[PDB]
């Protein structure tokens, strides 16, 4: 039986490809260099694998930016604005990631957006109405390929295959081509390819179709018959083609896999859905081949290596060890490097993590263990005993949040009462006048507040020191916004740095790393706080700072809190027990702060969850109505256990809520905020269709700018929201927290927000 990962991290162990780009990027090294370093990554990875013993190693994996970005440049599909500048293909791809200056013009980056359900962002095809392919010179995965091979590594190319590549793309500007009837134009570039990636010595190839997890579009449904209709008729002229889908099951796609007859084998995502393994078998062609995907891609725990052989087994007793290999479940690109890089972590987690570099090393141990588990019989007893001790730890048996759980009601879950009956205590307790305006969040990130917060967690200054700081500078806050005459204040959060870790650390049940950083964003990266254990709150964790701020501050000012989804989902979760037990206790730690809040003054708290609609499952019926659930639910037990006269607000980091404005509706918060400005103010239709009932605030300036938008323009903004929203319901609020702003902007952007207010404010007051 053979092993296989379906890609490995590029970033390298200590963010070197970061490093390397960046450095590229201002001008501290050469292209050549930047070349060189990325050549060295690939080589050090796949050695790593290899050396592991893995037997199916994937080459085109790596990226410099972005992997569908490099399929972009690999069928010529960059749009004209990019080629003009004459730049070589490095500055030509990293122009289209992230933007370029030539000649004086000022060339934007291609959207990215979330790939999948991952925090991984991809580059979006972008595509003309008149849009043909071609292959570029010297193809990457070929070059990549011939790489690898020369330096002793066979390899298997990775490929986004030609479906998902159109169905993951858009029409450029100007144009309004659908991009899937393409199609033709697409596929005898692929074979193109497949046919030269053969000649260069492959034997397979691993194409990724990961839209099958979807539920499709029967114009992309249709496309898979004659694309890979097209590669089998190819013969032996093309690489052996195993189509690889992950993060979902396909079971609701069985019409779809006939177009793969031709095709060699079928990887799925056993660790997302162990359940379709039967029914996926019952599927497959009588030679064709299963990649099981049984080591985790998404997360950093330690496989359970009995668990796993059992799903194998099942495999092989129905096809034959021949016909299944043993596979990471999705690309590595989703996992940290390695765990030997972390020294600080608690000495009994160890033994239960693995990231990338001991993933590979696991499907290699299981794919011997298959058939000769004598010869790792002393790993496979180690790794059940490593199951066991995770099971056994203090850490996943707290008594105390067990019980707590346990006895956790529907009633807990709702507001003493309804929006009506509360608006009215909430009107007087907070005396707002029509139109309040207030902010988001956060304020202008200097380099004082990042020197200070630095030197404090890094132990150069005393907390007392630190403290006085945060005071000084929420007092600051304070009286800019009393010279703005906004009606809702905000503390600012000078204390923190980043909303899922500051309250990871404040909470059991949450462990730190170092060095565990994953790539989410062309070269930036996150390091994700890991859930080892069941959680609680141990103390009071943003109190301090917004009791202080209420305590000098004329106008009600606003709690600021993570929601629990998120919490969850912006860290690597627990696997040994469900995602919804995990997001309860963090409801329940969260009602408690909430409540604390409520205690010390504060009766104005907003909760966001900008995880709620990433982690919905990818495709419709019990499963993702299951998750709308119990991650509805949690926000309202973290939010429901206030007065009527406390207003729960929450913001919005998108300006669509397509399948999806039930759930918000249904979280019953008093004032939503919605990133809108630079959107048309039609989108607002849905709060007229769905008859929103509650209090909503559109942003009325694109904070991502740092121009100041005019009065006049304040004005027209919000003269277009009250074409789709009733006066009495308006807040008036920018976009987006202020971190990235600076204070001058800031000062005449709010300036101008609250005069326009006022204006309105007299504009619809009572006639004579």
């Not at 309040?436 to 005393?462: A, C, D, L």
């Amino acid at each position: 039986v053979q092993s296989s990962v379906l890609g490995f991290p590029r970033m390298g162990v200590l963010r070197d490809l970061k490093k390397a780009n960046e450095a590229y990027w201002a001008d501290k090294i050469s292209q050549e260099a930047l070349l060189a370093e990325g050549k060295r990554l690939r080589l050090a990875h796949w050695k790593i694998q290899k050396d592991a013993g893995v037997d199916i190693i994937p080459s085109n994996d790596f990226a410099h930016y972005d992997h569908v970005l490099d399929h972009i440049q690999l069928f010529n599909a960059v749009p004209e604005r990019y080629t003009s500048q004459k730049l070589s293909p490095l500055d030509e791809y990293f122009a289209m990631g992230r933007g370029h200056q030539k000649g004086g013009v000022d060339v934007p980056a291609l959207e990215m957006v979330k790939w999948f359900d991952s925090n991984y962002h991809y580059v979006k095809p972008t595509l003309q109405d008149n849009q043909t392919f071609s292959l570029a010179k010297d193809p990457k995965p070929v070059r990549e390929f011939l790489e690898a091979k020369e330096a002793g590594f066979q390899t298997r190319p990775v490929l986004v295959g030609p479906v998902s590549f159109l169905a993951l793309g858009k029409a450029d500007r100007g144009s309004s081509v659908d991009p899937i009837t393409l199609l033709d134009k697409l596929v005898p570039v692929y074979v193109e390819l497949l046919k030269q990636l053969k000649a260069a010595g492959a034997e397979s190839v691993q194409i990724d179709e990961p839209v099958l997890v979807f539920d499709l579009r029967p114009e992309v449904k249709a496309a898979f018959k004659p694309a890979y209709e097209a590669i089998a008729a190819a013969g032996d002229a093309v690489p052996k083609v195993v189509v690889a889908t992950y993060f979902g099951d396909i079971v609701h796609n069985f019409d779809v896999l006939p177009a793969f007859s031709g095709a060699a084998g079928l990887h799925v995502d056993l660790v997302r859905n162990p359940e379709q393994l039967e029914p996926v078998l019952k599927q497959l062609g009588p030679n064709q081949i299963l990649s099981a995907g049984v080591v985790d891609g998404r997360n950093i725990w330690k496989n359970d290596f009995a668990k796993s052989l059992e799903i194998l087994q099942t495999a092989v007793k129905a096809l034959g060890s021949e016909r299944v290999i043993v596979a990471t479940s999705s690309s590595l690109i989703h996992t940290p490097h390695t765990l030997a890089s972390e020294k600080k972590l608690p000495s009994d987690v160890y033994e239960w993590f693995s990231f990338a570099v001991e993933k590979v090393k696991e499907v290699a141990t299981l794919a011997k263990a298959v058939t000769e588990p004598e010869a790792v019989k002393a790993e496979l007893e180690a790794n059940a005993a490593a199951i066991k001790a995770r099971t056994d730890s203090k850490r996943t048996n707290d008594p105390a949040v067990k019980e707590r759980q346990a006895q956790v009601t529907p009633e807990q879950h709702n507001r003493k009462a309804p929006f009506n009956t509360r608006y009215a205590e909430q009107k007087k307790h907070l005396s707002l006048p029509l139109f309040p305006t207030t902010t988001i969040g956060s304020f202008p990130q200097t380099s004082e507040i990042r020197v200070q917060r630095n030197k404090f967690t890094k132990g150069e200054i005393s907390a007392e020191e630190y403290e006085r700081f945060i005071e000084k500078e929420i007092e600051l806050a304070v009286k800019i916004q009393d010279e703005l005459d906004l009606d809702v204040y905000v503390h600012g959060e000078p204390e923190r740095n980043d909303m899922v870790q500051y309250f990871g650390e404040r909470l059991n049940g949450y462990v730190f790393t170092t060095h565990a950083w994953v790539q989410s964003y062309g070269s930036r990266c996150v390091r994700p706080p890991i859930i080892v254990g069941d959680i609680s709150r141990p103390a009071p964790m943003t109190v301090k700072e917004s009791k202080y701020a209420a305590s000098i501050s004329k106008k009600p000012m606003k709690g600021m809190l993570t929601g629990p989804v998120t919490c969850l989902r912006w860290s690597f979760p627990r696997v040994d027990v469900h995602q919804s037990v995990q997001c309860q206790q963090l409801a329940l730690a969260l009602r408690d702060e909430v409540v604390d809040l409520e205690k010390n003054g504060i009766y104005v708290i907003q909760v966001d969850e900008p995880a709620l609609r990433e982690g919905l499952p990818l495709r419709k019926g019990q499963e993702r109505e299951a998750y709308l659930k119990w991650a509805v639910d949690s926000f309202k037990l973290a939010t429901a256990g206030v007065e009527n006269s406390t207003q729960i607000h929450s913001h919005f980091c998108y300006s669509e809520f397509q399948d999806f404005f039930h759930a918000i509706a249904a979280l019953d918060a008093d004032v939503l905020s919605i990133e809108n400005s630079k959107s048309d103010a039609k989108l607002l239709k849905v709060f007229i269709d769905e008859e929103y009932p509650r209090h909503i605030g559109p942003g009325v300036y694109d904070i991502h700018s740092p121009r100041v938008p005019t009065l006049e323009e304040f004005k027209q903004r919000i003269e277009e929201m009250l074409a789709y929203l009733k006066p009495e319901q308006l807040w008036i609020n920018p976009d987006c927290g202020l971190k990235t702003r600076k204070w001058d902007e800031v000062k005449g952007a709010l300036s101008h927000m609250v005069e326009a207010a006022k204006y309105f404010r007299e504009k619809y007051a009572n006639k004579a």
